[PDB]
Ligand binder design. Structure first.
Ligand SMILES: CCCCCCCCCCCCCCCCCC(=O)OC[C@H](COP(=O)(O)O)OC(=O)CCCCCCCCCCCCCCCCC
Ligand SMILES: CCCCCCCCCCCCCCCCCC(=O)OC[C@H](COP(=O)(O)O)OC(=O)CCCCCCCCCCCCCCCCC
Ligand SMILES: CCCCCCCCCCCCCCCCCC(=O)OC[C@H](COP(=O)(O)O)OC(=O)CCCCCCCCCCCCCCCCC
Ligand SMILES: CCCCCCCCCCCCCCCCCC(=O)OC[C@H](COP(=O)(O)O)OC(=O)CCCCCCCCCCCCCCCCC
Ligand SMILES: CCCCCCCCCCCCCCCCCC(=O)OC[C@H](COP(=O)(O)O)OC(=O)CCCCCCCCCCCCCCCCC
Ligand SMILES: CCCCCCCCCCCCCCCCCC(=O)OC[C@H](COP(=O)(O)O)OC(=O)CCCCCCCCCCCCCCCCC
Ligand SMILES: CCCCCCCCCCCCCCCCCC(=O)OC[C@H](COP(=O)(O)O)OC(=O)CCCCCCCCCCCCCCCCC
Ligand SMILES: CCCCCCCCCCCCCCCCCC(=O)OC[C@H](COP(=O)(O)O)OC(=O)CCCCCCCCCCCCCCCCC
Lengths: 489, 489
C-alpha cells in the first residue's frame, strides 16, 4: 500500500498530528474505550469476573454494532480480551490463570458448527461448479414467477425448509448457492439483492426454531419437554405455525421497506438436460450428507456430532479432485473467524456466570406473575441477550431456570409452556449482523466486484423489527396453540 | 469443472468401468485400506484403543507419505478417523463416547501455535506489502554475496537465529517473507529455489532445539533440568554448538545434492532510503511482537501464551486498514488445516496411550545398558516417532521416563544427560513434510504460477539424511560437551 500519511499542522516548531486521529472511526474507538473504562471503574456486579465480563460484553457489542473495525477482527480480539479481562472461571469457582484461560478460550473456537459451515462451503461450491445449482434454480425460479416478491418468498421458504431439518448453519450457504444464478447478475446496490440476502438470513433464523431438531436449543428443550408428554407432533403443532407466520410477516416487511418491486426479472424456463455420471456422484454425496444430518441423533453413537458427518463431503470432494486447493483457499474465512468470535464470547459469558446472575435476579421478581407474564418478561430477556450473545448459550442457562419457576406454579401446564415458549423465544433475537451463522453469512456476502450487499445499519433497521415480529408470533399464535395442545401431567 | 469421465469398456451387454479406479492414486488407496484392515484385524496391542490407534497412525502416515490425497485433506480426515476408530480415552481410562470424543478432538485443533502462525502470516504480508522486507533483504543479500551457497547459508542462519528466540512456528514464514525479493523471481523447477525452501525448513527444525525457549519441548526439559543445576549457560553450551554443527552439515548436504551452484544471482546493492512514519509503525509493532514472544515466560501472568500475544499484531494491522479482508482471505489456510491435523493426530496418540506403552516397553529392556546406549536407543525411538508424531507430544511422554531411568542409574550425571539429550533428540525427526510447522510451511509453498517448490519425495530424500545428521551431531558433540559441562548433584 501507500507509505504516506496526511497530517493536521498547527503552526504554534509546529505540532503536526496525523488526520487518522480525528475521523469517525477514531471517535467510535475513543467512545468505546471511554465506556469500557467507566464500566471497569464503576461497581456493577458483586462478582469480579461478572463485573469485568459486563464490560467485556459491552466493548465487544459496541465494536460490532458500530463496526469501528472489521467484524471478524473484533472476533479475533475476543480471545485476547477474555484472557486480559480475567473472566473465565474454574469449576471450583476461582479465577482461571491466564495460561489456563488462554488454552480454554482457544479450544472453544473450533467446534462442530465450524465443520458444518466448512461442509456448507464445500457443498455450495461443488454444486455451483458442476452446474447442479443452475439446473435446480431453473425449476424454483420457474415456480416462483416473474414477481420479485414471489422469488423472495421462494428463497425464504427454501432456507426455512432446510433449517427445519439440518439447522441454519449450512442452510443459508446452500440457499445462496441455489440463488447464485440470480444473485451473481445483480450488484450490491440493488434493493432486490439486499432483500434477498437479508431475507435468507432472517428466514434461516426463524427456520431454526420450527422443528425439534432445527437448532441446538431446540434439541435441548426437547429433552426437557419429553417428561411432560410433548412429542414431535406436539412440537410441530406449535413451532411450525409460529415460524411460518413469523416468516410471512417478515416477508411482508422486506418487500414493503425495500424498493424491490419494480425490478424486472428474467424468465427462467426449466433446464431439462440429463445429469452426467459425475453429477450423480455429487448429488448422491450431497443428498446423503443432508440425510445423515437429519438423522444425527440416531447415528450419534458412531459419528458423535454433525461436524464429523460434515467431514465426509469434504474428503469425498477435495480428495477426489473435484475441488482444488485453490477452491479451499477461496473459501470465505472471515466468516469462520467471525463465527469463532461469537462462540468465544458465549464461553466467556457462561464461564463468568454473568447471564446466570442476570437471569436469576429476574426470576426472583417474576416468580409469582402468571404464565403469560413470565413468558413475555423472560422472552424479552432472551430477545435482548440473544441479539448479542449466542442463542445456544442463553438457552442452556434460561431453560432450566424457567423450568423450576414453572414447577412451583400451581398450573400443571405452566412448566411445559415456559420451557416450550422460552425455547422458541431463544431464537427470536436476530438484529445484530455479527451474531448467529445466518447473520454472519449474510453480512459477509459480496457481489462480483467485492462490494457488500448489506451493512450493519441495514441489518439493524430490519432485523430488530423482524425480531419483534417473531417474538409477537410466538406469544400470540404459539401461546394460543400451546394452551390447547399442551396438557399438564 | 468437466462433467464427463473416461471408461474402460470390455464387451462381454458390456461392463464399462471408469478409468479412475485403475490409477496410481487408486492403487495407493487400495493398498492403504488393505494395510489398515489387516492391522485392525490382527491382534497387535492388548489395549483396544492402542491397537486401533496403531492402525490409525499407520493409515494417516501412509496417506501423508504417499500423498494419495492432498495432505490437508488427510488432516481434515484425521478427526473423523479419531472418532470412528474410538481411540480417545477418559482420564478414568474408559473409551470416550463418540459425542465426547468429537468435542474433545475438535477442541484440540485450534491452539496457540495456530494463532502464532496467523500472526506470522500477518507480519510477513505487512512487511512485504510496505517494502520493508525488500530493504531488509537488500542488506542480507549484499552480505551473502553472489555465491548461491552463501545465500543459502545466510537464509538458514537467519531462520535458525529467529527460531532460537521465537521458535520455528513463525520464524519460517518471516524468513520466507524476507526472501520474497529473491524467491518470487525464481520458478518452482529451479534447484536453487527448492534448496532455499527446503533449507529454511530444515534449519528451522534444527534451530528449534538450540535454545531453552526455542520449542515447547525445550521449555519442558528446562523445567526438568533446573533441579539438577542446568541453567541457560549450561543449556547454550551444549545445544547451540550441536545445532550450529547440524545446520552446517545440512547446508553442505543441500548445496552438494542440489544443482544450485551454477545459478547466477543478481547483485543486491543495499537500499538506503529513509523509512516513512507508517513504515516505522509497522517496524515498531513487528519488533514489539517479536520481543514479547521472546519474553513470553516473563509475561505469562497477563497474556497466558504466545498465541494471545499473536493477536496484537493481527488487530493492529487489520483494524487500522493496513491489511484488507482480501489479504486475510488470501492467507494459506491449507497450512492451518495441515497443522491442525497434526495436532489432532498427536492428541489421539497421547490420549490412547500408544506411545507411552511403546516407550515403557523399550525402557523395560534398556533400563540397564549405560548412559550412551540408552541415549542412542531412545534417540532412535524419538527420531522415528517425531518423523510422524508431534515433537511436543513425544517429548512430554518420553522425558519423565528417561528421567526415572537416569535416576535409577548409579551415575549422578545420568539423569541430566538423559533428559538433555532426549530433549535435543526430540526435535531431530524431520523427514516427513507433513509434520511440524516449518515442514508444513515449506511443503505448502508455491511460486507465482502456483506450482509447488517441493514434493514429499524430495522432502524424504533430504529430510531423513538431515535427521540422521542432526542425531549424530547431538550424540557426538552435544554428548561430549555434556560429559564435561553437566555435573551431577
Ligand atoms: C479497538 C480496541 C478497543 C479495546 C478496548 C479496551 C478497553 C480499554 C479500557 C481502558 C482501561 C480502563 C482501566 C480501568 C481500571 C480497570 C480495573 C478493572 O476492573 O480491570 C482490571 C483487570 C484485571 O485485573 P484484576 O482486577 O487484578 O483481576 O484488568 C484489565 O481489565 C486490563 C485492561 C484491559 C486492557 C485492554 C487492552 C486492549 C488490547 C488491544 C490490542 C491491540 C489492537 C488495538 C486495536 C486497533 C484499533 C484500530
Ligand atoms: C455511558 C455508559 C453506558 C453506555 C452504555 C453501556 C451498555 C451496557 C450497559 C451496562 C450497564 C451496567 C449493567 C449492570 C448495572 C447494575 C448491575 C447490578 O448491580 O445488578 C443488577 C441486575 C441483577 O444482578 P444482581 O442484582 O447483582 O443479582 O443486573 C442487571 O440489571 C444487568 C443489566 C444488564 C443490561 C445491559 C445489557 C446490554 C448487553 C449488550 C451490550 C450493549 C449493547 C448496546 C449497543 C446496541 C446498539 C443497537
Ligand atoms: C464412498 C465410500 C464410502 C464412504 C463412507 C463415508 C464414511 C464412512 C462411514 C462408515 C460407517 C462406520 C461407522 C459404524 C461402525 C459400527 C458402529 C459403531 O462402532 O458404533 C456403535 C454405535 C453405538 O453407540 P451408542 O449408541 O453410544 O451405544 O452404533 C450406533 O448406534 C450408531 C450406528 C450408526 C450407523 C451409521 C450407518 C452408516 C451411514 C452411512 C455412512 C456414510 C455414507 C457415505 C456418504 C456418501 C455416499 C456416497
Ligand atoms: C484391498 C482392499 C481395498 C479394495 C476394496 C475397495 C476400496 C474401497 C473404495 C475405495 C475407492 C476406490 C477408488 C479410490 C480413488 C478414487 C479416485 C479419485 O479419488 O479420483 C477420481 C477422479 C479423479 O481421478 P482421475 O480420474 O484418475 O484423474 O475424480 C472424479 O472424477 C470423481 C468423480 C467420479 C465418480 C466418483 C469417484 C469414486 C469415489 C469413491 C469414494 C471412496 C474413496 C475411498 C473410500 C474410503 C472408505 C473405504
Ligand atoms: C482415503 C481414505 C482411507 C480411509 C482408510 C480407512 C480404513 C479402512 C479399513 C477397512 C475396514 C476393516 C475392518 C476390519 C475390522 C475392524 C475391527 C476393529 O478393530 O475396528 C472396530 C472399530 C471400533 O469398534 P469397537 O471394537 O466396537 O470399538 O471400528 C472401526 O474401526 C470402524 C471402521 C473405520 C471406517 C473408516 C471409514 C473411512 C472414512 C472415509 C470418509 C469418506 C472419504 C473417502 C476418501 C476419499 C479418497 C478419494
Ligand atoms: C503389510 C502390513 C504392514 C505394513 C506396514 C505397516 C506400518 C506400521 C507397522 C505396525 C506394525 C505393528 C506394530 C506393533 C506390533 C506388535 C505390538 C505388540 O504386541 O507390542 C510390542 C511392542 C511393545 O508393546 P507391548 O509389548 O504391548 O508393551 O510394540 C512395538 O514394538 C510397537 C512398534 C511400532 C512400529 C511401527 C511404527 C511406525 C509409525 C509410523 C507409521 C508407518 C510409517 C511408514 C510409512 C513411512 C515410509 C517412509
Ligand atoms: C498501540 C496501542 C497499545 C496496544 C497494546 C496492545 C496490548 C495491550 C496490553 C496491555 C497490558 C495489559 C495487561 C497487564 C495488566 C496488569 C497485569 C495483570 O493483570 O496480570 C498480573 C500478572 C501476575 O500473574 P501471575 O504471574 O500468574 O501471578 O502480572 C505479571 O506477572 C505479568 C506482567 C505483564 C506485563 C506486560 C507488559 C506489557 C508490554 C506491552 C504490551 C503491549 C505491546 C504493544 C505492541 C505494539 C506497540 C505499538
Ligand atoms: C476517552 C478515552 C479514550 C481516548 C484515549 C486514547 C485512546 C487510546 C488509543 C486509541 C487509538 C487512537 C486512534 C484509533 C483509530 C486509529 C485509526 C485507524 O485505525 O486507522 C488509521 C489509518 C487508516 O485510517 P484513515 O487514515 O482515517 O483512512 O491507518 C493507518 O494509516 C495506520 C498507520 C498509521 C500509524 C499508526 C496509527 C495509530 C494506531 C494506534 C493503535 C491503537 C488502537 C487502539 C488501542 C487499544 C488500546 C487502548
Amino acid at each position: 500500500g501507500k507509505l504516506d500519511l496526511e497530517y493536521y499542522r498547527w503552526p504554534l516548531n509546529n505540532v503536526a498530528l496525523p488526520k487518522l486521529f480525528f475521523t469517525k472511526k477514531a471517535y467510535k474507538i475513543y467512545f468505546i474505550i471511554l465506556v469500557t473504562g467507566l464500566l471497569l471503574g464503576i461497581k456493577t456486579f458483586n462478582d469480579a469476573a461478572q463485573h469485568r465480563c459486563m464490560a467485556l460484553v459491552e466493548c465487544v457489542a459496541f465494536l460490532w454494532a458500530s463496526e469501528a473495525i472489521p467484524l471478524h477482527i473484533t472476533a479475533f480480539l475476543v480471545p485476547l480480551l477474555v484472557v486480559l479481562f480475567k473472566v473465565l472461571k474454574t469449576s471450583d469457582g476461582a479465577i482461571m490463570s491466564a495460561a489456563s484461560a488462554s488454552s480454554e478460550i482457544l479450544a472453544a473456537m473450533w467446534s462442530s458448527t465450524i465443520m458444518i459451515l466448512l461442509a456448507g462451503f464445500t457443498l455450495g461450491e461443488v454444486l455451483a461448479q458442476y452446474n447442479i445449482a443452475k439446473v435446480l434454480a431453473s425449476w424454483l425460479l420457474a415456480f416462483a414467477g416473474c414477481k420479485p416478491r414471489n422469488v423472495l418468498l421462494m428463497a425464504m421458504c427454501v432456507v426455512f425448509f432446510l433449517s427445519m431439518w439440518i439447522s441454519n448453519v449450512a442452510a443459508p450457504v446452500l440457499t445462496y448457492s441455489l440463488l447464485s444464478p440470480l444473485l451473481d447478475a445483480m450488484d450490491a446496490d440493488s434493493p432486490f439483492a439486499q432483500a434477498l440476502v437479508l431475507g435468507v438470513a432472517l428466514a434461516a433464523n426463524i427456520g431454526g426454531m420450527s422443528s425439534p431438531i432445527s437448532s441446538p436449543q431446540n434439541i435441548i428443550s426437547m429433552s426437557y419437554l419429553k417428561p411432560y408428554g410433548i412429542g414431535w407432533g406436539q412440537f410441530f403443532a406449535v413451532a411450525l405455525p409460529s415460524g411460518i407466520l413469523a416468516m410471512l410477516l417478515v416477508w411482508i416487511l422486506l418487500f414493503t421497506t425495500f424498493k424491490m418491486n419494480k425490478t424486472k426479472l428474467e424468465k427462467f424456463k426449466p433446464i431439462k438436460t440429463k445429469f452426467t455420471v459425475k453429477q450423480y456422484y455429487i448429488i448422491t454425496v450431497t443428498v446423503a450428507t443432508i440425510l445423515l444430518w437429519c438423522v444425527e441423533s440416531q447415528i450419534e453413537g458412531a459419528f458423535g456430532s454433525s461436524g464429523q458427518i460434515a467431514i465426509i463431503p469434504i474428503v469425498l470432494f477435495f480428495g477426489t479432485g473435484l475441488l482444488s486447493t485453490q477452491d479451499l483457499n477461496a473459501f470465505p474465512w472471515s466468516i469462520v473467524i467471525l463465527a469463532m468470535g461469537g462462540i468465544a464470547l458465549g464461553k466467556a459469558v457462561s464461564s463468568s456466570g454473568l447471564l446466570s446472575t442476570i437471569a436469576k435476579a429476574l426470576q426472583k421478581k417474576i416468580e409469582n406473575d402468571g404464565v403469560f407474564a413470565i413468558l413475555c418478561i423472560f422472552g424479552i430477556l432472551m430477545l435482548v441477550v440473544g441479539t448479542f450473545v449466542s442463542h445456544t448459550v442463553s438457552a442452556i442457562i434460561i431453560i432450566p431456570l424457567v423450568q423450576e419457576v414453572g414447577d412451583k406454579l400451581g398450573n400443571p401446564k405452566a412448566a411445559p409452556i415456559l420451557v416450550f415458549g422460552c425455547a422458541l423465544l431463544s431464537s427470536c433475537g436476530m438484529g445484530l449482523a455479527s451474531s448467529g451463522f445466518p447473520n454472519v453469512t449474510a453480512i459477509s456476502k459480496v457481489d462480483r466486484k467485492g462490494d457488500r450487499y448489506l451493512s450493519v445499519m441495514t441489518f439493524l433497521t430490519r432485523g430488530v423489527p423482524a425480531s419483534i415480529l417473531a417474538f409477537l408470533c410466538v406469544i400470540t399464535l404459539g401461546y394460543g396453540i400451546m394452551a390447547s395442545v399442551v396438557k399438564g401431567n
